[PDB]
Amino acid sequence: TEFKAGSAKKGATLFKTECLQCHTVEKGGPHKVGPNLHGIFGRHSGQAEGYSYTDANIKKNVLWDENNMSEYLTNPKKYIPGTKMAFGGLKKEKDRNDLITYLKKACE
Ligand SMILES: O=S(=O)(O)c1cc2c(O)c(c1)Cc1cc(S(=O)(=O)O)cc(c1O)Cc1cc(S(=O)(=O)O)cc(c1O)Cc1cc(S(=O)(=O)O)cc(c1O)C2
Numbered sequence: 001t002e003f004k005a006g007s008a009k010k011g012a013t014l015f016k017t018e019c020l021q022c023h024t025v026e027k028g029g030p031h032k033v034g035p036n037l038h039g040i041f042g043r044h045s046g047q048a049e050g051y052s053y054t055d056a057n058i059k060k061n062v063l064w065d066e067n068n069m070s071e072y073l074t075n076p077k078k079y080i081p082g083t084k085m086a087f088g089g090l091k092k093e094k095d096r097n098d099l100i101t102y103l104k105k106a107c108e
Pocket residue numbers: 004005006007010092093094095097098
């Protein structure tokens with residue numbers, strides 16, 4: 001996939017409805033069902049401090065960027081077979097661009 005910067009405003013609403021139940025974004029924010037996402041961009045998969053990941057999420061062995069994030073969020077278990085993230089994915093390209101535009105700001 002090829003990320004294109006979109007609307008963080010639309011992305012924020014998508015995060016609220018699709019992601020917030022399992023994830024926080026703020027620095028020092030708590031783990032929930034899923035890990036806190038602060039600092040996710042640039043970091044090795046499966047490496048937030050204090051969170052117990054699947055071996056699949058750890059050993060995916062990629063650094064997160066906007067393009068592999070878009071691919072992941074299209075269909076999480078297809079990109080990371082073995083994942084325990086129970087999210088079906090955002091099939092729509094604009095949704096992923098907007099979400100990721102938001103995530104870049106919100107987890108900085
Ligand atoms: O910046 S905005 O988010 O306000 C914006 C709103 C509209 C827009 O048409 C665009 C931006 C331009 C635009 C950008 C992109 S992107 O490169 O992926 O960022 C894609 C499109 C687009 O028109 C094409 C498009 C895709 C989809 S998808 O099926 O979800 O992938 C839906 C739409 C698209 O126009 C419809 C649409 C939704 C929305 S929504 O408010 O975000 O739901 C605003 C506008 C729309 O035309 C009206």
